[PDB]
Amino acid sequence: RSAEALFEKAVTPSDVGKLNRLVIPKHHAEKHFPLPSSNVSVKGVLLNFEDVNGKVWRFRYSYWNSSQSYVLTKGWSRFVKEKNLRAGDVVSFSRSNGQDQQLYIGWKSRSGSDLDA
């Protein structure tokens, strides 16, 4: 079946700036995104986001900004370049209740008119 939108956030100029790294808040990555009860020591976590355009993407979960700030490194560059993503757009993430912890990445580009693509 289809997935369900977890949280929709806007991409800041920093997300697609020099760093070119994705960032995710804790207020949303705490109630929606759980924690691994097996691999906990020093390393981080991995993610697998699908693409509506018949494509696959894998991001790397890390601990940035003080600590509680979860950033998504690796994959962002290849993604932002593929879809030519930039600042001003909206980044949303969903989750499927299938058998595995599969996720999906969906973006949005508000133009204004309804006829606009």
Q: Where do the domains of the chain lie?
A: 1-117
Q: Which method resolved this structure?
A: NMR
**b/e map of 27-56 (b: 16 or more CB within 10 Å)?**
eebeeebeeeeeeeeeeeeebebbeeeeee
CA distances from 51 to 32, 38, 64, 104, 108 (A): 20, 28, 26, 7, 13
The topology under which CATH files domain 1-117 is: At1g16640 B3 domain (2.40.330)
Nearest to 79 by CA among 102, 60, 95: 60
